[PDB]
Design a protein around this ligand. Structure first.
Ligand SMILES: *[C@@H]1O[C@H](CO)[C@@H](O[C@@H]2O[C@H](CO)[C@@H](O)[C@H](O)[C@H]2NC(C)=O)[C@H](O)[C@H]1NC(C)=O
Ligand SMILES: [Zn+2]
Lengths: 595, 193
């Protein structure tokens, strides 16, 4: 008896026991989210602790079989997901200290508050009190004490705790035959044991740096248009050849530029398209919204919902004594049980959100025949990219005329297409230098290129050079400014938001050629096209049986990612930007500061 | 009359490894009532015609009964492979009979789970058709003896279903009755005209 038959008998026992035990954990969390009491949290934490103790006992069983004696690609992809271990290699005194540091950083963030200068009886939390100032105010001095006070009270308490977190995380990584903790995070994209479809951890650095240099001419013309329109809202405060201040970007951190739209509109007489009033006049309810989303997928070739979807979902607020958290989520409880929990209102924003959440359900129903360890997307960016393109076709004016929400005598306007394209660029294009700069700073600090006496010196050197954002006030070596973000203080990776945007426009550009679309890409509608639904279904039913380089070639015909479909979408906007910038300056210098 | 009312309307049904067998004789059966019942999801007869089929004096009839999942009903057929077909219940290549099944989700499911039905997961070999095996030994995978303990390469050779009323259609209970029309030299009192 070889060692391949011993590892095969082990997986036929693991599948039947892990499926029945993870279903009791998922069912005990549904009853808490729809009914918040004191007895529900007690039953939630009991069933959620049996799954964590069962899983770590079989992670030591899986390491009895060496990985170099198996010659099957199906078996080896399931063993490597069960042979991975984390903090178990440390001692008892080192593992106990690690969980004390992690829990102490999460309570300072969720309970910390910043008080108001010149009125010391007003202290405000982040979510109810400090997010409303940064997203709705137009005062220069009101946004300044809410930006400095969050970083001098909360960020200076995590500085002595974050240095000891780096040393303990670098000791766990070196005992697992890695070189540092940054190399540990990049192993999600690694592929092995393939002939021509291999991918390396060093190749990910080269792919990100190559695609970033091709979006730089587009970002410079958007940077110049915003700067010339912000000198009217804040006169005599921004230099005509320089960077942008960090506390005037419509956000606490500057992650999105969405809330700056009413200060810059190209055609101020042509209104926007809003169908929120024709639904009221035709007596639409919450069940009418989810029935229109189901007819969209049938016309492209995708199946219907099941019987238990309509009986077990919560599509409206109960209106009873129960307390329910209203957050739109799609649930895969297991054993072919699919539910959607959201609080629906008769608007246009809730019309488009129902198409996004139903796109997650269609992905989950495709790989249901895979083994239990291989039921996921190709990597950590594939799942959200499928849902984004489904909400992109339903907002086209050609589709809204076919469902009676627009009159038949509706004339297309060329001045309302510039208004639609500028608002898309403030969310998608404007967040891409932000994500590139965040992950590059953390990779160097786990390796040792940046000593601890030069942490804050290199943080503001890369803001001026890559993003073009200048600090309002100088800092020193007692601050920790990246630690004021949610993902840094809660130990999350940030590179998944960069690659998800690039995958989104590669699928959209390929499917509009199968549908024989004539014209520009922003008017594409894939409805009533059954040929484009058969192409997408071939990739959705694979799961994790194949590498992600194999699954990309089945749709777009290429192995690696590409940025040229993204530059073709904003091509009408790029011609209009260069005509407006004929009397301006493109670029910035890193010598001007507000202080 | 016939004991067909005691088979289809019994309150208790057996498991798939310890399945039941009943001999039915000395009665006349109305097979046309079963054909036009319009309640069974599957009705697939093999060897015999799907016609009226009443005036046929068969030798003997057996009624087998067990409960399985809804994704395993395709395995109750000649020339099929699977966990149920190899270790639990096997049909021969020359089979004359019919297979009747229907959903029983409203009778065999509880809030919290029902764990009274078992099936066999590991076995050394396969079995012949119409063979029943009941055992509670220890399945040894490798070469190290287990001596009645569950360690490495030692497993308990049984597994239980878990039935809830909120499961999907493939995981719901199904109640299966198999009728075999064996032919042999006999007076053949079971005709049912
Ligand atoms: C919401 O939760 C509460 C408590 O967690 C549930 O109240 C319990 O209901 C059961 C069944 O009716 C009773 O046996 C308990 O005595 C109740 N506990 C209390 C503290 O009152 C309530 O039923 C849940 N709501 C729904 C709709 O299931
Ligand atoms: Zn989503």
């Amino acid at each position: 008896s070889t060692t391949e038959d011993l590892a095969k008998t082990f997986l036929e026992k693991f599948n039947y026991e892990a499926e029945e035990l993870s279903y009791q954990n998922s069912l005990a969390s549904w009853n808490y989210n729809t009914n918040i009491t004191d007895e529900n949290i007690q039953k939630m934490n009991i069933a959620g602790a049996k799954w964590s103790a069962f899983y770590e006992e079989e992670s030591q069983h899986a390491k009895t079989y060496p990985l170099e004696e198996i010659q099957d690609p199906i078996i080896k992809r399931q063993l490597r997901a069960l042979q991975q271990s984390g903090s178990s290699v440390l001692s008892a005194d080192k593992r106990e200290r690690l969980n004390t540091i992690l829990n102490a950083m999460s309570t300072i963030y969720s309970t910390g508050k910043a008080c108001n200068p010149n009125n010391p009886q007003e202290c405000l939390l982040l979510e109810p009190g400090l997010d409303d100032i940064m997203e709705n105010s137009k005062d220069y001095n009101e946004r300044l004490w809410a930006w400095e006070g969050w970083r001098s009270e909360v960020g200076k308490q995590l500085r002595p705790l974050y240095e000891e977190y780096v040393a303990l995380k670098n000791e766990m990584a070196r005992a697992n035959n890695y070189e540092d903790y940054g190399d540990y995070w990049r192993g999600d994209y690694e592929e092995e044991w393939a002939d021509g479809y291999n991918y390396s951890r060093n190749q990910l650095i080269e792919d990100v740096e190559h695609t970033f240099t091709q979006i730089k001419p587009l970002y410079e013309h958007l940077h110049a248009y915003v700067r010339a329109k912000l000198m009217d809202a804040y006169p005599s405060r921004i230099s005509p050849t320089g960077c942008l201040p960090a506390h005037l970007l419509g956000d606490m951190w500057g992650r999105f530029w969405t809330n700056l739209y009413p200060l810059m509109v190209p055609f101020g007489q042509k209104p926007n398209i809003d169908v929120t009033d024709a639904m009221v006049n035709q007596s639409w309810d919450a069940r009418r919204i989810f029935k229109e989303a189901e007819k969209f997928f049938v016309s492209v070739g995708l199946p219907n919902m099941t019987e238990g979807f309509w009986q077990n979902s919560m599509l409206t607020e109960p209106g009873d004594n129960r307390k329910v958290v209203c957050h739109p989520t799609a649930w895969d409880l297991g054993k072919h049980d699919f539910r959607i929990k959201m609080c629906t209102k008769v608007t246009m924003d809730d019309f488009l959100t129902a198409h996004h959440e139903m796109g997650h359900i269609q992905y989950d129903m495709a790989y249901a025949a895979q083994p239990f360890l291989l039921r996921n997307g190709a990597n950590e960016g594939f799942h959200e990219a499928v849902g984004e393109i489904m909400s992109l076709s339903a907002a086209t004016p050609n589709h809204l005329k076919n469902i009676g929400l627009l009159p038949p005598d509706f004339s297309e306007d060329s001045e309302t297409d510039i208004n639609f394209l500028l608002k898309q660029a403030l969310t998608i294009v404007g967040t891409l230098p932000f994500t590139y700069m965040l992950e590059k700073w953390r990779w160097m600090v786990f390796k040792g290129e940046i000593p601890k006496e030069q942490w804050m010196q290199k943080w503001w050197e890369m803001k001026r050079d890559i993003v073009g954002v200048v600090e309002p006030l100088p800092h020193d070596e007692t601050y920790c400014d990246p630690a004021a973000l949610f993902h840094v203080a809660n130990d999350y990776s940030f590179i998944r938001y960069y690659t998800r945007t690039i995958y989104q426009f590669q699928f959209q550009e390929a499917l509009c050629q199968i549908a024989k679309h004539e014209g520009p890409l922003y008017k594409c509608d894939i409805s009533n096209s059954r040929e484009a639904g058969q192409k997408l279904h071939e990739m959705l039913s694979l799961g994790r049986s194949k590498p992600w380089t194999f699954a990309l070639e089945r749709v777009v015909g290429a192995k690696t990612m590409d940025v040229r479909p993204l530059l073709n979408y904003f091509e009408p906007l790029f011609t209009w930007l260069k005509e407006q910038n004929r009397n301006s300056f493109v670029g910035w210098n890193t010598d001007w500061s507000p202080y | 009359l016939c004991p067909f009312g005691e088979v289809f309307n019994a309150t208790r049904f057996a498991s798939v490894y310890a399945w039941n067998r009943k001999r039915i004789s000395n009665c006349v059966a109305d097979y046309s009532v079963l054909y036009n019942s319009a309640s069974f999801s599957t009705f697939k007869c093999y060897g015999v015609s799907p016609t009226k089929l009443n005036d046929l004096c068969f030798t003997n009839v057996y009624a087998d009964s067990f409960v399985i999942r809804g994704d395993e009903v395709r395995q109750i057929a000649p020339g099929q492979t699977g966990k149920i077909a190899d270790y639990n219940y096997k049909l021969p290549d020359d089979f004359t009979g019919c297979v009747i099944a229907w959903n029983s989700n409203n009778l065999d499911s509880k809030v919290g789970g029902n764990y009274n039905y078992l099936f066999r997961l590991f076995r050394k070999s396969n079995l012949k058709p119409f063979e029943r095996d009941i055992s509670t030994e220890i399945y040894q995978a490798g070469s190290t003896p287990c001596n009645g303990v569950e360690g490495f390469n030692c497993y308990f050779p049984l597994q239980s279903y878990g039935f809830q009323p909120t499961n999907g259609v493939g995981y719901q209970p199904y109640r299966v009755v198999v009728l075999s029309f064996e032919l042999l030299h006999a007076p053949a009192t079971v005709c049912g005209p």
